[PDB]
Write a protein that binds this DNA or RNA. Structure first.
Length: 112
RNA sequence: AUUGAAAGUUGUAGUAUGCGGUCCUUGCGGCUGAGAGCACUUCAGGAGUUGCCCGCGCCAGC
C-alpha cells in the first residue's frame, strides 16, 4: 500500500523548530527562502519553516506509540522506547531489543 | 554513437529537553457655580331698553 497526502494547515503562535540553543538568549526560529510571483518576475522571500527532519521524527514517535500497544510490540529497539532516532550510529556492531535481547547487524533480513 | 562505451559523492539524524518579563503602588488631599433684583406702574363690562297692549267665570239651576 502506497499513500500520498498533501494539503494546508492553519497555524498561529507556534515556536516550532527553532535555531538557537536553550542556554543561549534570543532563541531564533528557522527561516527558509521561497520563490513567488508578486505580479512580476520571480522573487525570493525568507519565511519561517519547519524542516522535514522534524516531521519525520514526530512520525517516528507516533508510529512507536501506536506500535507499542500491538501484540508484536516487543519487536522494537530499546532506543525507540526512548524516542531516540539514532539508528545504528558510527562505531557499533550490535543493537539491543526492547526486551533486552541482542541483535547482530550483519544482514538486513534479521534486522528488519 | 565521437578522449569514446556502463557510472545516485549515497543511505540513518528533533539545533533539542526545563523557564511567571514577576513581586509592592489611592491619579490622592482642600473647593458655596455665590452675593444684590416688584414681570411693576394707569384701566367702569359702560351707555339706552314697559313683559306692554285686548279679555264677563259667563248664561238656564223653586
Amino acid at each position: 500500500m502506497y499513500v500520498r497526502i498533501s494539503g494546508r494547515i492553519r497555524l498561529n503562535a507556534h515556536s516550532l523548530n527553532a535555531q538557537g540553543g536553550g542556554g543561549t538568549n534570543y532563541i531564533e526560529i528557522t527561516k527558509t527562502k521561497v520563490t513567488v510571483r508578486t505580479e512580476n518576475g520571480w522573487t525570493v522571500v525568507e519565511v519561517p519553516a519547519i524542516t522535514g527532519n522534524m516531521l519525520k521524527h514526530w512520525h517516528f514517535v507516533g508510529f512507536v506509540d501506536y506500535f507499542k500497544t500491538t501484540p508484536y510490540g516487543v519487536n522494537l529497539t530499546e532506543r525507540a522506547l526512548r524516542y531516540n532516532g539514532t539508528r545504528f550510529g558510527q562505531g557499533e556492531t550490535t543493537a539491543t531489543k526492547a526486551n533486552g535481547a541482542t541483535v547482530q547487524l550483519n544482514d538486513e533480513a534479521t534486522i528488519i
